[PDB]
Design an enzyme around this catalytic site. Structure first.
Site, PDB file in Angstrom:
ATOM      1  CG  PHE A  60       9.368   9.736   3.265  1.00  0.00           C
ATOM      2  CD1 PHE A  60       9.707   9.331   1.849  1.00  0.00           C
ATOM      3  CD2 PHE A  60       8.450  10.317   3.546  1.00  0.00           C
ATOM      4  CE1 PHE A  60       8.659   9.587   0.894  1.00  0.00           C
ATOM      5  CE2 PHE A  60       7.312  10.410   2.385  1.00  0.00           C
ATOM      6  CZ  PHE A  60       7.580   9.904   1.393  1.00  0.00           C
ATOM      7  CB  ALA A  61      14.374  12.262   7.351  1.00  0.00           C
ATOM      8  CB  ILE A  62       9.290  10.295   9.982  1.00  0.00           C
ATOM      9  CG1 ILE A  62       8.750  10.715   8.454  1.00  0.00           C
ATOM     10  CG2 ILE A  62       8.110  10.690  10.894  1.00  0.00           C
ATOM     11  CD1 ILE A  62       8.452  12.045   8.256  1.00  0.00           C
ATOM     12  CE1 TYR A  65      15.200   4.522   9.759  1.00  0.00           C
ATOM     13  CE2 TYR A  65      14.254   5.073  12.023  1.00  0.00           C
ATOM     14  CZ  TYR A  65      14.807   4.243  11.126  1.00  0.00           C
ATOM     15  OH  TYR A  65      14.575   2.910  11.310  1.00  0.00           O
ATOM     16  CG  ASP A 143      14.683   2.634   3.012  1.00  0.00           C
ATOM     17  OD1 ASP A 143      13.784   2.786   2.551  1.00  0.00           O
ATOM     18  OD2 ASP A 143      14.998   1.672   3.893  1.00  0.00           O
ATOM     19  CB  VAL A 144      16.711   8.548   5.059  1.00  0.00           C
ATOM     20  CG1 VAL A 144      16.112   8.100   6.470  1.00  0.00           C
ATOM     21  CG2 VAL A 144      17.532   9.844   5.123  1.00  0.00           C
ATOM     22  CG  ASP A 145      17.862   3.006   7.092  1.00  0.00           C
ATOM     23  OD1 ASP A 145      17.271   3.255   6.083  1.00  0.00           O
ATOM     24  OD2 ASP A 145      18.233   1.890   7.330  1.00  0.00           O
ATOM     25  CG  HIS A 165      16.104  -7.854  -0.324  1.00  0.00           C
ATOM     26  ND1 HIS A 165      17.024  -8.210   0.508  1.00  0.00           N
ATOM     27  CD2 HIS A 165      15.063  -7.312   0.527  1.00  0.00           C
ATOM     28  CE1 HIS A 165      16.553  -8.014   1.757  1.00  0.00           C
ATOM     29  NE2 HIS A 165      15.561  -7.576   1.907  1.00  0.00           N
ATOM     30  CD  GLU A 235      11.155  -5.309   0.637  1.00  0.00           C
ATOM     31  OE1 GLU A 235      11.190  -6.323   1.819  1.00  0.00           O
ATOM     32  OE2 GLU A 235      12.166  -4.664   0.755  1.00  0.00           O
TER      33      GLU A 235
HETATM   34  O1  LIG Z   1      10.831   6.009  12.390  1.00  0.00           O
HETATM   35  C1  LIG Z   1      11.093   6.246  11.087  1.00  0.00           C
HETATM   36  C2  LIG Z   1      10.847   4.737  10.608  1.00  0.00           C
HETATM   37  C3  LIG Z   1      11.143   4.723   9.169  1.00  0.00           C
HETATM   38  N1  LIG Z   1      11.379   5.823   8.331  1.00  0.00           N
HETATM   39  C4  LIG Z   1      11.660   5.953   6.901  1.00  0.00           C
HETATM   40  O2  LIG Z   1      11.160   4.632   6.303  1.00  0.00           O
HETATM   41  C5  LIG Z   1      12.301   3.986   5.716  1.00  0.00           C
HETATM   42  C6  LIG Z   1      12.244   2.543   6.027  1.00  0.00           C
HETATM   43  O3  LIG Z   1      12.561   2.282   7.452  1.00  0.00           O
HETATM   44  P1  LIG Z   1      13.923   1.469   7.966  1.00  0.00           P
HETATM   45  O4  LIG Z   1      15.130   1.688   7.027  1.00  0.00           O
HETATM   46  O5  LIG Z   1      13.639   1.551   9.426  1.00  0.00           O
HETATM   47  O6  LIG Z   1      13.779   0.134   7.121  1.00  0.00           O
HETATM   48  P2  LIG Z   1      14.831  -1.084   7.187  1.00  0.00           P
HETATM   49  O7  LIG Z   1      15.825  -0.917   5.944  1.00  0.00           O
HETATM   50  O8  LIG Z   1      15.087  -1.433   8.569  1.00  0.00           O
HETATM   51  O9  LIG Z   1      13.653  -2.454   6.587  1.00  0.00           O
HETATM   52  C7  LIG Z   1      13.612   4.580   6.599  1.00  0.00           C
HETATM   53  O10 LIG Z   1      14.784   4.628   5.776  1.00  0.00           O
HETATM   54  C8  LIG Z   1      13.154   6.024   6.662  1.00  0.00           C
HETATM   55  O11 LIG Z   1      13.214   6.720   5.205  1.00  0.00           O
HETATM   56  C9  LIG Z   1      11.466   6.994   8.904  1.00  0.00           C
HETATM   57  O12 LIG Z   1      11.725   8.144   8.515  1.00  0.00           O
HETATM   58  N2  LIG Z   1      11.328   6.936  10.389  1.00  0.00           N
HETATM   59 MN   LIG Z   2      16.315   1.280   5.663  1.00  0.00          MN
END
Ligand SMILES: O=c1ccn([C@@H]2O[C@H](COP(=O)(O)OP(=O)(O)O)[C@@H](O)[C@H]2O)c(=O)[nH]1
Ligand SMILES: [Mn+2]
Ligand SMILES: CCCCCCCCO[C@@H]1O[C@H](CO)[C@H](O)[C@H](N)[C@H]1O[C@H]1C[C@H](O)[C@H](O)[C@H](C)O1
Length: 279
Positions: A60-62, A65, A143-145, A165, A235
Site C-alpha cells: 500500500f502506497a497512500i 508513501y 509495508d512499503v517504507d 518483530h 498489528e
Molecule cells: O500515510 C500513510 C501511512 C501508512 N501507509 C501504509 O501503511 C504502512 C504502515 O505504516 P507505517 O509504516 O507508517 O508503519 P510503521 O512501520 O511506522 O509502524 C506503510 O508502510 C504504508 O504501506 C501509507 O501508505 N500511507
Molecule cells: Mn513501516
C-alpha cells in the site's frame, strides 16, 4: 501432483550437528523458524519451481508513501523471489505517482486504485486485501517504507506465516505490546502469547491470507462498533489471529529489521528486508 526432484549434489545434513545452536529454529507446534543456515535454497528453489509457483506481493502506497515505491520495487527486483513468477499488487490513491520500474522476466505489476483515509490507512489494508485466487499461489503482505538488502525467497512460503518483530524477539511475553483491554477483540492476557509478530510482513497461501484478513477485518469492525481501537491497530489483531491460528512457518527478524534503530547483532547473519528511515 508433485514430480521427482532431479539428482542434486550438496553437503549431507548432519543429524548430530545442528546448523544453529544460538537460536530456536522450530516452534513448539513444529513450525520452522527461518534463519540463515537452516535451509538449502537450491533444494527449496527446485521444489517450488517444479510447481510453477506464483507469488503475489501486496503493498500500500497512500498519500506521501508513494515516495517509497521506487526503492522498494527496484530492490525487490534484486532480492525477492528471483527466478520465480512474481505479481506485484500496488494499492495507491495516486496511480500516476507509481514509478516506472524495470522488471525481470516472469514478473508483473498491477496498480490498484483505492480511496485515501485521513491508523485508518494502515488498518484498512486487511479490508482491501480481503482475483488473487486466480492469479497467484501465495500472497505476501508488506509495508512499503522498506528496502530489500538480501535474499528473500521461497524459504518463506507455507500456508501461513508471521515475522518476529525486531524489537521483541528477546522479550518475555508480559513485555509484548499486545492489546491488554478485555473489551477488544484483539485482547491477549499476560499469561498468553508465543511471539510478537510484526504487522509489516506476513503471508501464506491465498486461502489462508484471505481467512486471516477477513477475520482481522471482522474483529476491527466489532471493536469500532464497541468504541475501541486496538493499541497497535492491525498489528494487534494480527497477533491475536496468529495466537489462535498458529503459523506454519515463522520468519526470523532477518526478514524485518531496522539497522538505524537496532544495529547488526551477532544473531543476524543477514539483514534481508529493512526499514527506510522516515519522519
Ligand atoms: O500515510 C500513510 C501511512 C501508512 N501507509 C501504509 O501503511 C504502512 C504502515 O505504516 P507505517 O509504516 O507508517 O508503519 P510503521 O512501520 O511506522 O509502524 C506503510 O508502510 C504504508 O504501506 C501509507 O501508505 N500511507
Ligand atoms: Mn513501516
Ligand atoms: C523510534 C521508534 C521506536 C519504535 C520501536 C518499536 O517498534 C514499534 O513497535 C510497535 C509495537 O510495540 C509497532 O509495531 C510499531 N509499528 C513499531 O514501529 C516501527 C517503525 C519504527 O521506526 C521502527 O522501524 C520499528 C522497528 O518499527
Amino acid at each position: 501432483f508433485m514430480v521427482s526432484l532431479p539428482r542434486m549434489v550438496y553437503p549431507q545434513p548432519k543429524v548430530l550437528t545442528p546448523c544453529r545452536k544460538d537460536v530456536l529454529v522450530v516452534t513448539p507446534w513444529l513450525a520452522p523458524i527461518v534463519w540463515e543456515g537452516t535451509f538449502n535454497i537450491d533444494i527449496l528453489n527446485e521444489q517450488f519451481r517444479l510447481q510453477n509457483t506464483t507469488i503475489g506481493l501486496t503493498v500500500f502506497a497512500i498519500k506521501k508513501y508513494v515516495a517509497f515505491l521506487k526503492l522498494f520495487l527496484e530492490t525487490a527486483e534484486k532480492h525477492f523471489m528471483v527466478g520465480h513468477r512474481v505479481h506485484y499488487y500496488v494499492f495507491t490513491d495516486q496511480p500516476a505517482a507509481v514509478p516506472r520500474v524495470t522488471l525481470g522476466t516472469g514478473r508483473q505489476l498491477s496498480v490498484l486504485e483505492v480511496g485515501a483515509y485521513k491508523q485508518d490507512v494502515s488498518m484498512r489494508r486487511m479490508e482491501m486485501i480481503s482475483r488473487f485466487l486466480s492469479e497467484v499461489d501465495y500472497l505476501v503482505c508488506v509495508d512499503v517504507d522498506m528496502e530489500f538488502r538480501d535474499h528473500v525467497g521461497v524459504e518463506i512460503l507455507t500456508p501461513l506465516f508471521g515475522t518476529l518483530h525486531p524489537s521483541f524477539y528477546g522479550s518475555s511475553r508480559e513485555a509484548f505490546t499486545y492489546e491488554r483491554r478485555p473489551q477488544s477483540q484483539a485482547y491477549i492476557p499476560k499469561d498468553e502469547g508465543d511471539f510478537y509478530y510484526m504487522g509489516a510482513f506476513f503471508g501464506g497461501s491465498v486461502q489462508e491470507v484471505q481467512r486471516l484478513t477477513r477475520a482481522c477485518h471482522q474483529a476491527m469492525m466489532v471493536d469500532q462498533a464497541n468504541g475501541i481501537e486496538a493499541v497497535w491497530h492491525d498489528e494487534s489483531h494480527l497477533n491475536k489471529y496468529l495466537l489462535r491460528h498458529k503459523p506454519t512457518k515463522v520468519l526470523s527478524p532477518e526478514y524485518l529489521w531496522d539497522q538505524q534503530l537496532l544495529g547488526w547483532p551477532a544473531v543476524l547473519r543477514k539483514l534481508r528486508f529493512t526499514a527506510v528511515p522516515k519522519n
